[PDB]
Symmetry: C2
Subunit: 267 residues, 2 copies
């Protein structure tokens, strides 16, 4: 709730300098927080803020830079997957941490990723994930940049599965990957189907799903869900949550410490 | 001109990133294309390739948003001038065109700019005919963000007379072109009977790319209203007619094509 409000201020400042608009964003956000952070609430708040700002994608540039760095280093990430003793687990780790990397940069990322692999998963259900990947799999993405790293795990999954369906956001909201991000990363060449969550909610809002996507989720033999908002919406089974616990609330919910990497299957 | 394109590629890239490798890659690939083969197809192909290299979906997202914001702020004043004029239809045409050109207290300044452009009037003035054809099925082919707010004033005038009104925007972001979100922000979806896209988001119109619904609506139209220079350049060799081109002739090639001088405003019907 606090972070959200800071994030509203940040977004507004990405778009505009009009203090009237910026304060209108923050003030209208305060009003909504006071009346009712949930996925439905954060979504409702960002949408209202974008409406006040008259913007479609305030994070357009910030997402592009994440895509750019991901593109630069992905061949190296592949090297580490292909070269590891357990490619599937290493692909999981890469999908979780690749976009956590801090801004040549190619050498630094090699160190970062090798360090995260040494630390490993605090919760490591990757063998079970691998097992369940033989069925119809739905891969629910999170951010731009990150979606480039997700392609590595999709290829691994693609070795076993009956079918792979990727889901992205139907409209830009914060740094979430949209269908264009998925095309940049060539998700449409790897996955058998590429779908949206509808009007582009943070997390999943069942009411907003297109019928094709809802069906794919219900019929899935495994859902792979990236990040915190997805976890908080979907805790539909079996589901694997791949994420870093970046906050106390999420960490306590999952049963790890902050900063821990998680690949958790709720069977 | 290809010189303006190339400069615009540099500008787009700089909007997104500071990596010189990526910037120079954008400019260099753009140069290769220009040497191999500005057409709508060509400019579309070049911006798409540049967006790919940059890993970006809308480098103009902030620039478009500011245009939307100013438009919002001064629209009520534009409305005053339309409703207060002796020929609201023609004034709505002029507003929609100068909404494609143009600060705390910028409300007073714009009053002066709009008043001036109405005094200058249209060098080609086919607005009576446009008004006459607006009784039928109408398709309104938009151009930029910001501008689309001003377009709503002409849509309302058209909406007094027409069997039907279909608005068309870009299916994906390209340069500052209005997309479906831009149209929602301007409430196009509340004025028009249908709100469609041109598909994969081309500059201008690329017939190959239109969704079936949009292609039908263009073919079945009694009148297409087309905004700006790219739309003119794609539709001017008139497979689809009657069509009205509302634009300013901002460069010598377009001006010579249409038969006006640079800076001249045009509301030209071809049929
Ligand atoms: Cl609201």
């Amino acid at each position: 709730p606090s972070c959200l409000l800071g994030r509203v201020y940040y977004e507004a400042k990405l778009v505009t300098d009009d203090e009237d608009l910026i304060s209108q964003c923050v003030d209208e956000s305060l009003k909504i927080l006071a009346e009712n952070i949930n996925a439905h609430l954060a979504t409702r708040i960002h949408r209202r803020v974008y409406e006040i700002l008259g913007v479609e994608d305030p994070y357009a540039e910030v997402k592009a830079r994440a895509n750019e760095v991901a593109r630069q280093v992905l061949p190296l990430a592949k090297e580490i997957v292909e070269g590891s003793d357990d490619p599937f687990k290493t692909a999981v780790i890469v999908s979780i941490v690749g976009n956590n990397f801090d801004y040549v940069v190619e050498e630094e990322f090699r160190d970062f990723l090798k360090r995260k692999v040494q630390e490993g998963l605090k919760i490591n259900d990757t063998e079970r994930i691998k097992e369940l990947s033989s069925g119809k799999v739905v891969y629910l993405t999170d951010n731009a940049g990150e979606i480039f790293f997700d392609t590595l795990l999709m290829k691994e999954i693609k070795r076993r599965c009956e079918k792979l369906t990727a889901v992205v956001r139907g409209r830009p909201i914060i740094s979430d990957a949209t269908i264009e991000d998925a095309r940049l990363a060539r998700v449409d060449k790897i996955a058998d189907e590429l779908l949206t969550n509808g009007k582009g909610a943070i997390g999943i809002i069942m009411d907003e799903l297109p019928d094709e996507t809802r069906k794919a989720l219900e019929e899935a033999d495994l859902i792979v869900a990236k990040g915190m908002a997805n976890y908080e919406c979907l805790s539909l089974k079996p589901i694997a949550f791949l994420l870093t616990a970046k906050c106390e609330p999420v960490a306590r919910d999952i049963g790890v410490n902050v900063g821990d990497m998680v690949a958790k299957v709720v069977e």
